[PDB]
């Protein structure tokens, strides 16, 4: 009965297409084009899940499509501390600027691969880690979000969680 609309931002690769195909569909793929999407669930809700372009040649487009939002997911990659520091240094920023009081769900993703061996070599070779949950959870705290969430597109783990409270958030 209720209509909720929900626009997904973050760094590109931070798995932001992933994310909305797993739910939809309960399966893992990639689309290339930018598409929404939908999805009839009971918290009676229809919501509609908008995905969007990170990458900065779309940030004076992207904008367009953040009117009328009810609520947003702001997503980081928890094994890249780069789509991390982003979210205060740019999606936070953008998205308060178009709309300011919306509500906001910090979301973790990949967190299938914070524990991979191979993932945590890589980010080593950098002098990087991945997010732990408590900072993670800092972040959150700073951009006054209304949840800290984190998930998994892979193995699906939290992510009928982070839409449940997404919804939460509306309701
Ligand atoms: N291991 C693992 N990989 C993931 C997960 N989610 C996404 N990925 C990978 O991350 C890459 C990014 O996928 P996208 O969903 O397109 O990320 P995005 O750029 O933020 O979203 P779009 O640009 O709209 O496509 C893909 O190659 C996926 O294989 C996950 O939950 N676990």
């Given at each position: 009965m209720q209509a909720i609309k929900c626009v997904v931002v973050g760094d590109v690769a931070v798995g932001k297409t992933c994310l909305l195909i797993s739910y939809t569909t309960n399966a893992f793929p990639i689309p290339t084009v930018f598409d929404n999407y939908s999805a009839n669930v009971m918290v009676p809700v229809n919501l509609g899940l908008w995905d969007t372009a990170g990458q900065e040649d779309y940030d004076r487009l992207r904008?367009?499509?953040?009117?009328?939002?009810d609520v947003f997911l702001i997503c980081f990659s928890l094994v890249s501390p780069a789509s991390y520091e982003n979210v205060r240094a740019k999606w936070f920023p953008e998205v308060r600027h178009h709309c300011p009081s919306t509500p906001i769900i910090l979301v973790g993703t990949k967190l299938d691969l914070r524990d991979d061996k191979d993932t945590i070599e890589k980010l080593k070779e950098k002098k990087l880690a991945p997010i732990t949950y408590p900072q993670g959870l800092a972040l959150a705290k700073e951009i006054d979000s209304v949840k800290y969430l984190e998930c998994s597109a892979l193995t699906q783990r939290g992510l009928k969680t982070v839409f449940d409270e997404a919804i939460r958030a509306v309701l």
């Open positions: 904008p367009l499509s953040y009117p009328q939002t």
